[PDB]
DNA sequence: GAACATGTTC
DNA sequence: GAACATGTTC
DNA sequence: GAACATGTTC
DNA sequence: GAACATGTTC
């Protein structure tokens, strides 16, 4: 019933938080997060872990969904999916059990459920909430992004926000955050160029 | 011929391959370099070539255009439309040609789009038609349906377009070839290649 | 139910400890431990003993598991196994009764049980806990690592953490530690180069 | 012939073995040293050779390529793909050649991959095909499927590739050979060997 | 990772 | 069309 | 164990 | 492509 996915930050009754672990300080590493820009620069198809933190545990069976959305108004109503070349190629989709049309995957979780909504057409991925590891702060989730932002046919050169929601089994939203995501072959240089440009300006 | 011959060959008939004066302007959708024997065109933008012949003979002769990757090492790969273009709609929808084909003909509606069962090679064949009364030579209007840059098709692997005049039985009569480059800026690209050529 | 093996240090209710006996001070010896880096440099296929110490004895039938895991996020979900050339070659697997696909073996224990998990696919080796030798501090376990870190097909050039867990018969974790493991043909030089580099930097 | 003859021999037909100009560039996937009579190629990267003949005779003649270790002392060992490559998927999956074979042919789909029952030797045979109309010589596109450095295959034991022109019955007509080196940097390796050659 | 490719933006 | 934007070669 | 091999990294 | 990384020869 939500043809515009909500994008606005919502700290839940549980202060829901999404953060990133030791991103490279090097241009080298395949993913990096700009705290300044609230932006993730990642590389196509590579593992990209996030940290969720909450102030109190949610009820059992609570889940965490990741749903990509186009940021610009003329694109906001366009469902974000894999470009046809990636969707129908050989490279990743055939081994994996996740559906080929999906942009966002989860690594290492076998309760992950890949959702295509019949009414809204939105593509998303859900995992059950797990409390952190014993004596730790954060619950880590491993994502894989399956097109570059640059990919034609797919989300071509349009910028996307990644919405992470904490949800009850009902679907009821208990928390929500988002950040801009960029998938490309040079996340360190791109991060610097954007940061340099933002600061110049 | 699992790998098609590419070096030039003339026929029984003068078999000329030419290009109308390309604009020397950057504002032209296509332009040809006599220097490099290279054609610069824009994706999906009709580009005319001139074949000219001296005799009109055999009763079912045809002319085919077949792209092949130029480097020996990429040469056994069939040149096709990238999946992204193949499956998109912008040009795929409404015409009478297979979406997987890189090369189309626009004027002839008796164009035959050929897929070799053994080699998988894709080419486009048209019947020879004598020129229009009072025009000197018959023109063939091609459409190139991916940029060379195209992703999952040819990725930035230069291609040579072989045009051959053929009898009904397949015997090769005339054949020529040139390197083809499909991009969004053929005039600038032409200029860079010719510059990077005189000294380099 | 643990597609990401826990890697975090856990001193159990028994202060569980994993240490190393007289590693060579020489470049010569086939294995060596860097206390600085928490890293074991060992040589392919050679005996590599460890010392476990506990502050109180655990209950009877407690076991000790060794499970290799890739350290880097994009590799973390990849099961660590022997490279095909080692797995299917003549050299060690045929004499030994341990399964050829396993990276980590135990020497000299006939209750060692080599586990391939049907749900998670993880490869590990378990032995029953033994109190130390009379009048001694530590219980020694003899491991054999069956690929170099450098081995292509196998864990090729990716770094691995070795997780040693103290476990009840149930599987319940009573203690856990880990260290980075490196298997190569020159552990002394490599140790020095890494130590030299860490200290420079 | 449990151990195959390796020294060069010519045939009834001019039997030339050549290489298209290799780039003198480091950026080429392969390059050949006329000096050492050594071919430097990259793993799995198609590399063309030129056989040329003067007469096209016998009705079922073929041309085989068979790798052999060059040192006398390693010579009785069959040259094969390392188990790591044999069992991996990256190239093993989707084509029509046994994974254990080091040498493949890419253009011919009538390639016959031979495993000698007595010697266990592996080679690849193709039928002689006359050149393409107007091209001068038929090209054969090889693929080398391990680096020489490859682990459990040839470990850093240099190999000589023997190419022989053969009648249907097996009688040896022409044969030549050269040393082959498969690695991730053929241009640099070429340069080091030729340098370590002029003075040393 | 610097320099280069090439398509889009304005 | 210059200037900017992105994946790729070296 | 120093010098050399050779493949990867950036 | 230079510089770094690893198993192997001597
Ligand atoms: Zn894509
Ligand atoms: Zn295309
Ligand atoms: Zn191994
Ligand atoms: Zn190999």
Every domain of chain A and the residues it spans: 1-201
Q: How far is CA B117 from the centre of its chain?
A: 21
Q: Is B87 on the interface with A (CB under 8 A)?
A: yes
**Cα B127–chain centre separation:** 16
d(CA C165, CA C2): 14
List, in order, residues 6 or more apart from A194 with CB less than 8 Å away.
A34, A37, A39
Annotated ligand binding at A48? The verdict is no
Other beta carbons within 10 Å of C53: 15
- Which SS3 state, helix, strand or coil, does residue D20 take? coil
d(CA B151, CA C8): 43
Measured CA to CA, the distance from residue A72 to residue A78 in angstroms comes to 10
Residues of C in contact with A134 (CB under 8 A): 6, 8, 10
Six-digit token string for A30 = 């395949």
Chains with ≥3 CB–CB distances under 8 Å to A: B, C
Q: Do the Cβ atoms of D182 and D23 come closer than 8 Å?
A: no
Q: Specify the 3-state DSSP secondary structure of B60.
A: coil
Query: 46-75 in C: which are within 8 Å (CB) of A?
Result: 73-75
Give the CB-side neighbour count of residue D104, counting CA atoms within 13 A.
21
Question: What's the CA angle centered on B135, arms B129 and B140, to 5 degrees?
Answer: 45
- Provide the token pair at C157: 């050039």
Nearest to A39 by CA among A164, A188, A181: A181
Joined tokens for residue D18: 């050549």
Contact of chains C and A by CB distance (3 or more pairs under 8 angstroms):
yes
Angle at C166 between CA C161 and CA C168, to 5 degrees: 140
CB D139 within 8 A of CB D50: yes
Which resolution, in Å, applies to this structure?
3.1
Residue D37's H or E segment, with its range, is: none
A63, A128 contact by CB (below 8 A): yes
Q: Give Cβ neighbours of residue A25 (< 8 Å, ≥ 6 apart).
A: none
8 A C-beta contact, residue D54 and residue D13: yes
Euclidean distance between CA atoms C133 and D184, whole angstroms: 53
Strand bridging mode A63-70 / A31-34: unpaired
Question: What are the structure tokens assigned to A167, written together?
Answer: 């949800």
Report DSSP letters for D95-156, one per residue. SSS-TT-SEEESS-TT-EEEE-TTT--EEEEEE-----TT-SS-EEEEEE-S-TT-SSSS-S
Determine the Cα angle at B195 with ends B194 and B200, to 5°. 105
Q: Answer whether B41's CB lies under 8 Å from B30's CB.
A: yes
Closest-CA residue of C relative to A140 is C4
Residue C87's φ and ψ, nearest 5 degrees, are -65, -40
Q: What does the H/E/C string look like for D69-104?
A: ECCCCCCCCECCCCHHHHCCCCCCCCCCCCCCCCEE
Question: What count of residues does chain C have?
Answer: 201
Between CA D160 and CA D181 the distance in angstroms is 8
Name chain B contacts of D132, Cβ cutoff 8 Å. 1, 3-5
How many CB atoms neighbour CB A55 within 10 A?
Answer: 11
Nearest CA to the C1' of H4 belongs to which residue? C193
For residue C110, give every residue at least 6 positions away whose Cβ sits within 8 Å of its Cβ, in sequence order, or none: none
For residue B28, what are the contacts with CB-CB under 8 A and spacing of at least 6? B22, B186, B187
What is the experimental method?
Answer: X-ray
Which H or E run contains A24?
none
Instruction: Find tokens 């069959």 and name the residue.
Output: D78
Nearest CA to D32 among D18, D14, D45? Answer: D18
> What whole-number distance in Å separates Cα of residue C183 and Cα of residue C151?
9
Quote the radius of gyration of chain B (alpha carbons, Å). Answer: 16
D1-200 has CATH 2.60.40.720 classification = yes
Dihedral of CA atoms C98, C104, C105, C106 in degrees, nearest 10, equals -150
Using only C-alpha atoms, chain A has a radius of gyration, in whole angstroms, of 16
Q: Determine phi and psi for A75, rounding to 5 degrees.
A: -110, -10
Closest-CA residue of B relative to A152 is B84
Stretch (H or E) spanning C80: none
How many Å apart are CA A59 and CA A42, to the nearest integer? 32
Q: Is A175 exposed, middle or buried (0-12, 13-18, 19+ CB in 10 A)?
A: buried
Rounded-to-integer distance, Cα C42 and Cα C33, Å: 8
d(CA D5, CA C144) in angstroms, rounded, equals 44
CB B72 within 8 A of CB D106: no
Q: Name which CATH class applies to C1-201.
A: mainly beta
DSSP state of B78: B
Q: Is C48 annotated in some ligand binding site?
A: no
Task: Please count the other Cβ atoms lying within 10 Å of the Cβ belonging to residue D7.
Answer: 8
Q: How far: D185 CA to E5 C1' (Å)?
A: 23
Cβ-based contacts of A49 with chain C (< 8 Å):
73
Distance from CA of A46 to the nearest CA of C (A): 6
Between CA B188 and C1' F3 the distance (Å) reads 14
Cα separation values, D28 from B125, B158, B162, B165, Å: 35, 15, 25, 34
CB D67 within 8 A of CB D7: no
Runs of H (alpha helix) within C14-162 = 73-76, 84-87
Burial of A31: CB neighbours in 10 Å, binned 0-12, 13-18, 19+ = buried
Asked whether the beta carbons of residue A107 and residue C8 sit closer than 8 angstroms, the reply is: no
Contact C152, D84 (CB under 8 A): yes
CA–CA gap between residue B177 and residue B67 (Å, rounded) = 9
- As given in the structure block, the two tokens for residue B170 are 């397949």
C:117-136 residues touching chain A, CB 8 A cutoff:
119
Is C36 an interface residue toward D (CB < 8 Å)?
Answer: no
Phi-psi region of B170 (alpha: psi -120 to 50; beta: other; left: phi over 0): left
Measured in whole angstroms, the distance separating CA D80 from the mean position of its chain's CA atoms is 13
Spatial separation of the C-alpha atoms in residues A175 and A165, rounded to whole Å: 6
Interface of A with B in 165-194 (CB under 8 A): none
Q: Dihedrals φ, ψ of B140, to 5°?
A: -120, 125
Distance C97 CA to G3 C1' (A): 40
Residue B28 neighbours by CB distance under 10 Å:
18
For residue B88, list chain A residues with Cβ-Cβ distance below 8 A. 84, 153
Identity of the residue in A30, A110, A136 whose CB atom sits nearest the CB atom of C3:
A110
| Partners of residue B126 on adjacent β-strands | B63
SS3 D67: strand
Which chain D residue is nearest to residue B8, measuring alpha carbons?
D134
Q: Count H helices, E strands: chain B?
A: 2, 11
- Confirm if C182 and C70 have CB atoms less than 8 A apart: no
């Amino acid at each position: 019933h939500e043809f515009i996915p909500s994008n606005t930050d919502y700290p839940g009754p549980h202060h829901f938080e999404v953060t990133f672990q030791q991103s490279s300080t090097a241009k080298s590493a395949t993913w990096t997060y700009s705290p300044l820009l609230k932006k993730l620069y990642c590389q196509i198809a590579k593992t990209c872990p996030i940290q969720i933190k909450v102030s109190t545990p949610p009820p059992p069976g609570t889940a965490i969904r990741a749903m990509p959305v186009y940021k610009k108004a003329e694109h906001v109503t366009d469902v974000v999916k894999r470009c046809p070349n990636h969707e129908l190629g050989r490279d990743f989709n055939e081994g994996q059990s996740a559906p080929a049309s999906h942009l966002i995957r989860v690594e290492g979780n076998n309760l992950s459920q890949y959702v295509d909504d019949p009414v809204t057409g939105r593509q998303s991925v859900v995992v059950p909430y797990e409390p952190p590891q014993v004596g730790t702060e954060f619950t880590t989730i491993l994502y894989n992004f399956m097109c570059n932002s640059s990919c034609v046919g797919g989300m071509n050169r349009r910028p996307i926000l990644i919405i992470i929601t904490l949800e009850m089994r009902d679907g009821q939203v208990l928390g929500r955050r988002s950040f801009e995501g960029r998938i490309c072959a040079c996340p360190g240089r791109d991060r610097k160029a954007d940061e340099d440009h933002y600061r110049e300006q």
